[PDB]
Write a protein that binds this ligand. Structure first.
Ligand SMILES: NC(=O)C1=CN([C@@H]2O[C@H](COP(=O)(O)OP(=O)(O)OC[C@H]3O[C@@H](n4cnc5c(N)ncnc54)[C@H](OP(=O)(O)O)[C@@H]3O)[C@@H](O)[C@H]2O)C=CC1
Ligand code: SF4
Ligand code: SF4
Ligand code: SF4
Ligand SMILES: [Zn+2]
Lengths: 297, 208, 114, 63, 176, 95, 156, 51
């Protein structure tokens, strides 16, 4: 343990937590929340960004001076990844897009990029690697999203033996795409069961997995405290919002039930209390305003 | 003595001493000490229980006419049991004079408000509360005026540190500015600048 | 030992003023929650009010609790009108603060703070 | 009479606004400071001083 | 020794009353204001063409801090810590040790330009004219840490601006 | 003349080089480490030694009021040249 | 190819359009606001740069934090910044909004306005001279001039 | 002054602090658009008012 990485302080903004974390794709939603949680305890965060620097502007007040280092990177440029991760002691992978594009399809964003990041981090001698996948990721799924997630997480686990794979079920928050997708529809009802998990709980679970040394090589499953049927969930969403972009893959994903994985550790094994939807739905959907809770199975 | 020393005034010293004797002999109930400084300033140290009459006398006597209120200053001296020194500064326009009235008050005991004498103090002592915690009884509207709304404690007390106990920073998770414990990037370097040698022989305290 | 009182002559009048201040705060809490479109429930805010009232409950000097009654009444009056923002109301709920270690073992692990 | 006989303990810990962590885990020290041995002056050793124990100060990671 | 402004009693005769009525109806003072605005339309404006033109400044101008050198190549500062003691904002941090040849020199001379108030106490307290509030003012930065100067940035500033700081101090030192 | 530590990072005139295991070098990648190419000890190492004929010499750094305060240097010891404490110049007696 | 050249031309067109009409929101807090008003004098004349004087905070493009940002004003400044439409830029006048400056160790002063809002251009001084803020505004215009929004959008 | 080289207490009296204290009496019976002139006629600068 080097002297510059030994923690000090009282865990405040100006303290030292001794974490050198490279967060890939930190300009998104989960990346923004992870950078906010990492910067408040006094950690060194290295953010490789592909978009405009202005879109990274909101990442500046997340920490103290010099604790967030923005640098350019490219998905198919291995040397940029070697540049980014050769000084960090933990790498977090959050790269993912909900829809395919002309330059980056689902395979190149879910298979090639995570495997390349893991291989580069393995060659650079990093200590802790975290890869974010989906809970319902299966090889034999009907949609491309879960297929590519399953293949990518298999390749990541094969490439890095100590890779901690984190599987959120479905995440709701201020800048999410689950409750904001439902409330803005003004697809249909089915028999699917889902158990959403609060974004702050996922971020705290990731941070608690960073802190402990016993979580290396595991495969967690971040699921919410209560399971909801889709019809009651969308009725609750429309009732909170005081109301009377899409693709085929999202349509398939909405009509897929959330699987149960009892053999894998969850949020309670990391000391995280799963916040229910009824305590945060008002905060999430107060923007849409110009109530009985949903029934749980 | 002539070129580089400020000249001394003696007729103003005599007139201020005469008026101090006149005040001390005209209100023996509340006056405790009367002093005239070297630079011709008169200070009257009186009891707190006469905060209202004495100043009212200076507001309404024919020979005083201290119509204007200049200052309302609180001085915190922790080594006394009455650690707060409330000081009024009065200005008389007819006779063109300045006077200083001093009283002592600790944390818990209140002092009667001087709003009915000078209305300007209706703001001034309000700030005193917001800086010292000295309660002013029968004040019309006494609340904080300078510090933050959620501020705990009083800053100008000598046991209060220079930097506060909380700092404000914006958090995106709660989408709000929030208070956190203070953690400075650089500690305020305390400079030991007191000379170990005696400076003024005429100001020497007697030994214990 | 004889002192000048502020508002209350003895402990009973200070207790009565404590009761009246708590009654006014309990009346205000739902209106404060609704006015600032707060994220908390009514019972959580009343629990916070009770927690402050019982945290500041180990002092028996009538002048001290009289001054605390006056300061709480200033807080109540500031919440009567729209003088505070959402931040000043939410400051009482230490939500963004990381929970400090309390037991001896975790305090030994994190540093030298007793 | 306008005077009340109070024999209670003079405690204003709840009026100063200090958090509890800095009124129970701190050690106040009342002492007369020692004369600086490189000087013969003793004017700084005439008043009692109140000080607090030094807590943790670390190095800034940036600079 | 006192003059009564706004204590001019208006004339009550027919001439002044009729003239005031004509002023009220015909807007004569408004016509005077229009004439003044027309006269001030045609004057040449005082707009200097920045950055191709620069404002008038004095040799005593206080700007970016810099560390000077002797006319032999050696750094002027002797780590006497007067500037960090006189600094009202405590922007100057000095850490020193005796170097290889035994000379008393600095190892860390940090000026926090975001803390500094540009008061010039360091440039007058310095007994060897090492630190100077130089003439540069166009050094706005895009990042906060670029305004946190170490010893190397100040020495580079001194090496960059010595050719004009020496002339300014030569023109100014007889007033000090 | 500066040196080069074998991590690729330049050496300051103080002697401060980040180690191979120091993460703070991530603040330099994509940017540059600003150092001074004119070392003060090397710049004064090429100054000649002034030979005078007086036991006590006086130095003020040149220019009068634009130099350091005037200091007197004794040159009795012929083993070591008398070096000024402010400007670093050294004087030698001919005898 | 055709697409990259076309989006580059459109990018520099909209970039010139945005950088040539920067409408500010002046925060009249302290000394540096008076220095801003003296930069608005006929000698320096911001208005020839396409920069209007004293625009409403609901239509402004840039905000100049001139003065000390205390604890009692930070929620108001954050509310004003959140109300101002995208794209929004922040220019920091003085040492007060840079790092607190004189009042860095005061109990009720926010140590830099970077802790409340993202800050693009830091202008040093106490107060910075009027031509120094003019150079900072020109630096902000050059920072806008090299923006690559449409090229990144086409590449993504 | 306490005898050392530092001031014990230095109160700043503002001319505009007492001038703003009379603002409640200043604008009694006037229109809401007159306070931009009642503030104007008193040289009120918010530096020395708030210290
Ligand atoms: N729906 C959900 O919330 C869930 C998400 N996950 C997984 O969590 C991760 C994070 O999700 P989320 O925050 O919602 O995603 P976002 O779409 O919000 O953010 C993705 C981030 O990665 C970058 N990025 C995306 N595609 C590429 C690419 N081809 N090359 C380079 N950079 C790229 C984006 O850059 P830019 O700034 O240009 O947009 C952005 O910074 C993903 O891997 C996702 O699959 C898991 C479970 C549930
Ligand atoms: S100009 Fe004044 S405030 Fe700035 S570094 Fe020098 S002494 Fe300090
Ligand atoms: S006052 Fe001058 S010689 Fe002394 S430490 Fe400062 S810069 Fe160096
Ligand atoms: S930086 Fe200086 S000039 Fe500007 S507001 Fe602060 S004290 Fe005033
Ligand atoms: Zn010399």
């Amino acid at each position: 343990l080097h002297h510059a990485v030994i923690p000090h302080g009282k865990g405040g903004r100006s303290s030292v937590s001794g974490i050198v974390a490279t967060v890939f794709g930190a300009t998104g939603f989960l990346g923004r929340y992870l950078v906010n949680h990492l910067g408040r305890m006094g950690s060194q965060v290295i953010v490789p960004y592909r978009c405009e620097p202005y879109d990274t502007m909101h990442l500046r007040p997340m920490g103290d001076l010099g604790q967030i280092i923005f640098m350019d990177w490219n998905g198919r440029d291995k040397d940029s990844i070697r540049r980014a991760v050769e000084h960090s002691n933990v790498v977090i992978n959050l790269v993912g897009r909900e829809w395919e594009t002309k330059n980056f399809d689902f395979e190149d964003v879910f298979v090639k990029i995570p495997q390349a990041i893991a291989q580069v981090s393995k060659e650079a001698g990093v200590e802790k690697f975290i890869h974010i996948s989906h809970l319902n990721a299966d090889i034999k799924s009907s949609s491309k999203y879960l297929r590519n997630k399953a293949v990518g997480e298999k390749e990541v686990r094969e490439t890095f033996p100590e890779a901690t794979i984190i599987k959120p079920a479905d995440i709701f928050g201020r800048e999410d795409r689950f409750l904001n997708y439902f409330a803005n529809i003004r697809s249909l009802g089915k028999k699917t069961v889902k158990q959403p998990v609060y974004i702050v709980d996922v971020t705290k679970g990731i941070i608690n997995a960073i802190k402990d040394p016993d979580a290396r090589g595991k495969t967690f499953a971040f699921v919410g405290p209560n399971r909801y049927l889709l019809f009651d969930l969308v009725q609750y969403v429309f009732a909170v919002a005081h109301r009377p972009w899409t693709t085929r893959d999202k349509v398939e994903r909405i009509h897929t039930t959330d699987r149960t994985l009892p053999h894998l550790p969850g949020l309670e094994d990391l000391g995280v209390q799963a916040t229910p939807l009824e305590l945060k739905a008002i905060e999430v959907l107060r923007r849409h305003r110009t109530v009985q809770p949903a029934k749980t199975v | 003595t002539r070129p580089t020393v400020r000249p001394r005034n003696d007729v103003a010293h005599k007139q201020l001493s005469a008026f101090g004797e006149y005040v001390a002999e005209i209100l023996p109930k509340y006056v405790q000490q009367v002093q005239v400084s070297c630079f011709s300033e008169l200070e009257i140290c009186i009891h707190p229980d006469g905060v209202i009459p004495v100043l009212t006398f200076l507001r309404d006597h024919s020979n005083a006419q201290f119509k204007s209120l200049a200052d309302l200053t609180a001085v915190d001296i922790p080594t006394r049991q009455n650690r707060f020194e409330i000081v009024y500064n009065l200005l008389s326009l007819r006779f063109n004079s300045r006077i200083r009235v001093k009283t002592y008050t600790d944390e818990l005991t209140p002092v009667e408000s001087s709003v009915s004498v000078y209305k300007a103090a209706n703001w001034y002592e309000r700030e005193i509360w917001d800086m010292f915690g000295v309660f002013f009884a029968n004040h019309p509207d006494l609340r904080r005026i300078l510090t933050d709304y959620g501020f705990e404690g009083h800053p100008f007390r000598k046991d209060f540190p220079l930097s506060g106990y909380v700092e404000l920073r914006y958090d995106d998770e709660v989408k709000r500015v929030v208070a956190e414990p203070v953690e400075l990037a650089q500690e305020f370097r305390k400079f030991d600048l007191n000379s170990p040698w005696e400076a003024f022989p005429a100001y020497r305290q007697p030994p214990e | 030992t004889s002192v000048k009182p502020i508002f209350s002559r003895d402990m009973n009048e200070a207790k009565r003023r404590v009761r009246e201040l708590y009654r006014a705060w309990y009346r205000e809490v739902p209106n404060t929650v609704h006015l600032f479109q707060l994220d908390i429930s009514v019972k959580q805010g009343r629990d916070k009010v009770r927690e402050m009232f019982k945290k500041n409950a180990h002092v028996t000097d009538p002048r001290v609790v009289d001054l605390l009654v006056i300061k709480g009444k200033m807080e109540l009056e500031e919440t009567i009108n729209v003088w505070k923002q959402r931040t000043h109301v939410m400051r009482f709920f230490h939500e963004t603060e990381a929970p400090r270690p309390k037991d001896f073992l975790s305090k030994f692990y994190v540093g030298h703070d007793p | 009479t306008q005077l009340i006989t109070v024999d209670e303990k003079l405690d204003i810990t709840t009026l100063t606004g200090v958090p509890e962590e800095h009124i129970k885990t701190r050690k106040a020290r009342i002492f007369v400071p020692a004369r600086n041995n490189m000087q013969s002056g003793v004017n700084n050793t005439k008043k009692w001083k109140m000080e607090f124990d030094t807590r943790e100060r670390w190095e800034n990671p940036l600079m | 020794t006192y003059k009564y402004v706004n204590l001019r009693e208006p004339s009550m005769d027919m001439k002044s009353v009729t003239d005031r009525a004509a002023q009220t109806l015909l807007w004569t003072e408004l016509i005077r204001g229009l004439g003044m605005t027309l006269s001030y339309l045609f004057r040449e404006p005082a707009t200097i063409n920045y950055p191709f033109e620069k404002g008038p400044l004095s040799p005593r101008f206080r700007g970016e801090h810099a560390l000077r050198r002797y006319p032999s190549g050696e750094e002027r500062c002797i780590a006497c810590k007067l500037c960090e003691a006189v600094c009202p904002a405590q922007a100057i941090t000095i850490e020193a040790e005796p170097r290889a040849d035994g000379s008393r020199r600095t190892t860390r001379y940090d000026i926090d330009m975001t803390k500094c108030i540009y008061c010039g106490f360091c440039q007058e307290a310095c007994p060897v004219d090492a630190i100077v509030e130089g003439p540069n003012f166009e050094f706005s930065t895009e990042t906060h840490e670029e305004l946190l100067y170490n010893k190397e940035k100040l020495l580079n500033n001194g090496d960059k601006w010595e050719a004009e700081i020496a002339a300014n101090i030569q023109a100014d030192y007889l007033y000090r | 003349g500066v040196r080069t530590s074998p991590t690729g990072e330049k050496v300051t005139h103080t002697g401060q080089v980040y180690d191979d295991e120091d993460y703070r070098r991530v603040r330099f990648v994509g940017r540059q480490k600003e150092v001074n190419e004119n070392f003060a000890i090397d710049l004064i190492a090429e100054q000649p030694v002034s030979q005078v004929g007086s036991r006590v010499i006086s130095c003020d750094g040149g220019g009068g009021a634009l130099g350091h305060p005037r200091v007197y240097i004794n040159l009795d010891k012929e083993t070591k040249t008398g070096t000024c404490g402010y400007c670093g110049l050294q004087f030698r007696q001919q005898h | 190819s055709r697409g990259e050249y076309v989006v580059a031309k459109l990018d520099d067109l909209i970039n010139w359009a945005r950088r040539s009409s920067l409408w500010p929101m002046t925060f009249g807090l302290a000394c540096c606001a008076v220095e801003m008003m003296h930069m608005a004098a006929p000698r320096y004349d911001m208005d020839r740069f396409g920069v209007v004087f004293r625009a409403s905070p609901r239509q402004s493009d840039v905000m100049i934090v001139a003065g000390t940002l205390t604890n009692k004003m930070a929620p108001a400044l954050r509310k004003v910044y959140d109300q101002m439409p995208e794209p929004r830029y922040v220019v920091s006048m003085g040492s007060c909004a840079n790092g607190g400056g004189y009042y860095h160790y005061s109990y009720s002063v926010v140590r830099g306005c970077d802790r409340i809002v993202p800050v693009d251009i830091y202008v040093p001084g106490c107060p910075p001279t009027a031509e120094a803020l003019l150079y900072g505004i020109l630096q902000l215009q050059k920072k806008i001039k090299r923006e690559k929004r449409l090229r990144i959008w086409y590449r993504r | 002054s306490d005898g050392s080289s530092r001031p014990y207490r230095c109160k700043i009296k503002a001319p505009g602090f007492a001038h703003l204290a009379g603002l409640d009496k200043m604008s009694k019976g006037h229109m809401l658009a007159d306070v931009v002139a009642i503030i104007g006629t008193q040289d009120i600068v918010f530096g020395e008012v708030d210290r």
